[PDB]
């Protein structure tokens, strides 16, 4: 579309403040659960990444929610599923910082 | 020829670098030739800004003149115009400091 | 909230695969003609996720260089440049050396 | 209709595997003309060869001398009347 070289424009929008997938460890809370192993050892969430056009402005979330996602708790005669909830962002926004 | 293009200042593969500051005037100078061309000012991402009074003013020989600009306006503002099916777009990058 | 993301998908979306990471572009040479690069960060495909155990690490099995056009604002009517990075196409869980 | 002997579970079978040893993915089938694929997300897919990877309808997949590649989730897949059926298998080693 716009080169083998990623064009400016396509570079900016791609690297702009939006919610995006970030690997995150298991939550202190399901790290305590009585289980022989926890599968997987990490969960990918959606979080305000990218960057603002300033040192001053920071990419923050204007829309967010807790995701319930089931983790496998290998244990006992039979493994079972446990629910892990954490912070996940849907809407993001580049906003001014704090002092 | 390419005559039929809505936007006066040609090109826009690279946006025009416009210096600005919060609280003061912002001019997105995407002036068209013919007065009656439908131009829609956007702002990456999905928030379009529509003319009125101060907070947005449309001018054919000038452009979108924003009184009391904010951070909401810092970055890539795109001017769009569809002429005979073809969607022309000119780009403008703002900043401070 | 919404619905409980099923384990299959939690696992699916948690394995060693190439995934988009925000790379802040401060690390390199930042002196040029005085100013800042735009954007001041990039998005690139990189091996991520967690492997079955601490014994295995998540490494790339295919990568490439990505030339990405970057604008460096400064003096005077400032110019647009280039940079290359390491994008990952395929990954795998390998035992740590 | 379902090709795999064990009814589907959200919980995969746990297997205590070890490298260099024999690994069995015990997804035996109910009928004899079924082409069962052993898949491994992301996209790794183990193609049997008759020796190193052995398919058998009354036992499943048999892998003499398991590797690190085999640590993780292994999914037996089968298509019956278009309907894709999968049985997930989680393998792990000590430590």
From Swiss-Prot, chain A:
Subcellular location: Secreted
Disulfide topology: 17-59, 48-92, 52-94
UniProt tissue specificity: Expressed in all tissues except liver. Highest levels found in heart, skeletal muscle and pancreas.
Top-level taxonomic group: Eukaryota
Posttranslational mods: VEGF-B186 is O-glycosylated.
Family of the protein in this entry: Belongs to the PDGF/VEGF growth factor family.
Function noted in UniProt: Growth factor for endothelial cells. VEGF-B167 binds heparin and neuropilin-1 whereas the binding to neuropilin-1 of VEGF-B186 is regulated by proteolysis.
Subunit structure: Homodimer; disulfide-linked. Can also form heterodimer with VEGF.
Protein name: Vascular endothelial growth factor B
Organism of derivation: Homo sapiens
Gene encoding the protein: VEGFB
Swiss-Prot record, chain B:
Expression by tissue: Detected in normal lung, but also in placenta, liver, kidney, heart and brain tissues. Specifically expressed in most of the vascular endothelial cells, and also expressed in peripheral blood monocytes. Isoform 2 is strongly expressed in placenta. Isoform 3 is expressed in corneal epithelial cells (at protein level). Isoform 3 is expressed in vascular smooth muscle cells (VSMC).
Induction (free text): Up-regulated in coculture of VSMC/endothelial cell (EC) or by direct exposure to VEGF of VSMC monoculture. Up-regulated from the second trimester of pregnancy to the term and in the placenta of women with preeclampsia (PE). Up-regulated in monocytes exposed to bacterial lipopolysaccharide (LPS).
Disease involvement: Can contribute to cancer cell survival, proliferation, migration, and invasion, and tumor angiogenesis and metastasis. May contribute to cancer pathogenesis by promoting inflammatory responses and recruitment of tumor-infiltrating macrophages. Abnormally high expression of soluble isoforms (isoform 2, isoform 3 or isoform 4) may be a cause of preeclampsia.
Domain of life: Eukaryota
Family as reported in the entry's similarity comment: Belongs to the protein kinase superfamily. Tyr protein kinase family. CSF-1/PDGF receptor subfamily.
Residues annotated as glycosylated: 36, 68
Comment on protein domains: The second and third Ig-like C2-type (immunoglobulin-like) domains are sufficient for VEGFA binding.
Domain named Ig-like C2-type: residues: 23-86
Protein role: Tyrosine-protein kinase that acts as a cell-surface receptor for VEGFA, VEGFB and PGF, and plays an essential role in the development of embryonic vasculature, the regulation of angiogenesis, cell survival, cell migration, macrophage function, chemotaxis, and cancer cell invasion. Acts as a positive regulator of postnatal retinal hyaloid vessel regression. May play an essential role as a negative regulator of embryonic angiogenesis by inhibiting excessive proliferation of endothelial cells. Can promote endothelial cell proliferation, survival and angiogenesis in adulthood.
Assembly mode: Interacts with VEGFA, VEGFB and PGF. Monomer in the absence of bound VEGFA, VEGFB or PGF. Homodimer in the presence of bound VEGFA, VEGFB and PGF. Can also form a heterodimer with KDR. Interacts (when tyrosine phosphorylated) with CBL, CRK, GRB2, NCK1, PIK3R1, PLCG, PSEN1 and PTPN11. Probably also interacts with PTPRB. Interacts with RACK1. Identified in a complex with CBL and CD2AP.
Cystine pairs: 30-79
Post-translational changes noted in the entry: N-glycosylated.
Protein name (Swiss-Prot/TrEMBL): Vascular endothelial growth factor receptor 1
Whole-protein residues included: 129 to 225 of 1338
């Amino acid at each position: 579309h716009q080169r083998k070289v990623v064009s400016w424009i396509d570079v900016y929008t791609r690297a702009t403040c939006q919610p995006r997938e970030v690997v995150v460890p298991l939550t202190v809370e399901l790290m305590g659960t009585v289980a022989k192993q926890l599968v997987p050892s990490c969960v990918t969430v959606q979080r305000c990444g990218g960057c603002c056009p300033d040192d001053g402005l920071e990419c923050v979330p204007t829309g967010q929610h807790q995701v319930r996602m089931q983790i496998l708790m290998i244990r006992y005669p039979s493994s079972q599923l446990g629910e892990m909830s954490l912070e996940e962002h849907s809407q993001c926004e580049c906003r001014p910082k704090k002092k | 020829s390419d005559t039929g293009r809505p936007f006066v200042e040609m090109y826009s593969e690279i946006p025009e670098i416009i210096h600005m500051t919060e609280g003061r005037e912002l001019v997105i100078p995407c002036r068209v030739t013919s007065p009656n061309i439908t131009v829609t000012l956007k702002k990456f991402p999905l928030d379009t800004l529509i003319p009125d009074g101060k907070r947005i003013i449309w001018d054919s020989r000038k452009g979108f003149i924003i009184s009391n600009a904010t951070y909401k306006e810092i970055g890539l503002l795109t001017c769009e115009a569809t002429v005979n099916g073809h969607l022309y777009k000119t780009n403008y990058l703002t900043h401070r400091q």
